[PDB]
Amino acid sequence: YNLICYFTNWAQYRPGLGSFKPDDINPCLCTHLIYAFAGMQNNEITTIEWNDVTLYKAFNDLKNRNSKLKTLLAIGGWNFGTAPFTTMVSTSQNRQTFITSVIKFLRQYGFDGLDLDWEYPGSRGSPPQDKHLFTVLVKEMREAFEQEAIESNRPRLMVTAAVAGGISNIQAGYEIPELSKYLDFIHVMTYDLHGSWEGYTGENSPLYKYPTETGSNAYLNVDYVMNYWKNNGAPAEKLIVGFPEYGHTFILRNPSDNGIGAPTSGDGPAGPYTRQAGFWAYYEICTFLRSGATEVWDASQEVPYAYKANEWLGYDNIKSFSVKAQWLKQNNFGGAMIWAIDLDDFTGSFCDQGKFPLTSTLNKALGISTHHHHHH
């Protein structure tokens, strides 16, 4: 199994104990590390942060401590939008300009591949032809990478993609059987399945549907989404389940009405380190739990939630990660990806569960590292 871990280049700006840089990563936890994000200018890949080149070096130097580790660079993301991708794929010349720039960039800075995070072809402004042109891009990139491997006498660069977990976005965006032949891994974003775009509480990454959900609401769970990809042509061994190391918070309209599907009035209060209403890192979650919140296990969906007065939290913990890891192995998927390792309790000082409790849980459950026998 694979354990693919995203690192974000803005985590460094969080205050105090929230600040996270590449040298804070334990190099033995994951099998693949992905650097989020690079950008694009004039149809070529580029850096975004002033110190990206310095961080790139520190990131890829982690391979000196774990010879099996592979690193990838991700391009795009939610805030990047779609317009630069649409223009880049619209002509063969623009795609070749981009692909050539990628090969040079990855080899220059020591990355083993590119992760495409276009969110999403065919949605958010992207016109319908981008569904097919995304396949064309991935095909041409895979072929270019195969040719570069022969010409430079080096192992081929990898090409992966982060893909939608919402059904409407999947149908508008991806030619699943063709795309599956050219991608090395398919990282399915099976999180943010509920949030304050809806007017009621719901879980971030439930494994199963809630009993009352019907219609399109019955698709908002990990099991349905992963099986949708599989049943529509993606090989199970290339499919990677997304795991969030954060939760969403809501304000309850009525504190007595505090279950799943209860009416809400908006986002919960920002945490002191991530500073985003509606969102808490796992280490911020631990503070909330230990301050007196009530913790509930939702047995239908196999995830926890917690509330305190009019604040409600949908999240994941060690138990839900463990249940989902067992489930994914039983369904023969290729492994797990985490968004994002800088949101784990990496110092160990918030949750009393060791360093990197959530990420270590997946490392153990998928057998990446085993309990060694060192008695003598």
Q: Is 245 annotated as a binding residue?
A: no
249/267 Cα distance (integer angstroms): 6
Q: Which helix (H) or strand (E) holds 99?
A: helix 92-109
Count of C-beta atoms within a 10 Å radius of residue 210: 19
Q: Is 50 annotated as a binding residue?
A: yes
Q: Is 297 annotated as a binding residue?
A: no
Residue 178: strand, helix, or coil: helix
Main-chain phi, psi angles of 247, to 5 degrees:
-135, 170
Q: Is 49 annotated as a binding residue?
A: yes
Q: Is 77 annotated as a binding residue?
A: yes
Q: In the annotation, is 119 catalytic?
A: yes
Please pick, among 44, 119, 151, 284, the residue that the annotation labels catalytic: 119
223/241 Cα distance (integer angstroms): 10
Residue 247: strand, helix, or coil: strand
Residue 99's contacts (CB-CB under 8 Å, 6 or more residues apart) are 140, 141, 144
Q: Is 192 annotated as a binding residue?
A: yes
Distances (CA, A) of 303 to 120, 133, 135, 296: 27, 38, 35, 9
Q: Is 87 annotated as a binding residue?
A: no
Q: Is 247 annotated as a binding residue?
A: no
Q: Is 120 annotated as a binding residue?
A: yes
**Binding-site residue set for chitin:** 49-50, 76-79, 120, 189-192, 339
**Residues involved in catalysis:** 119
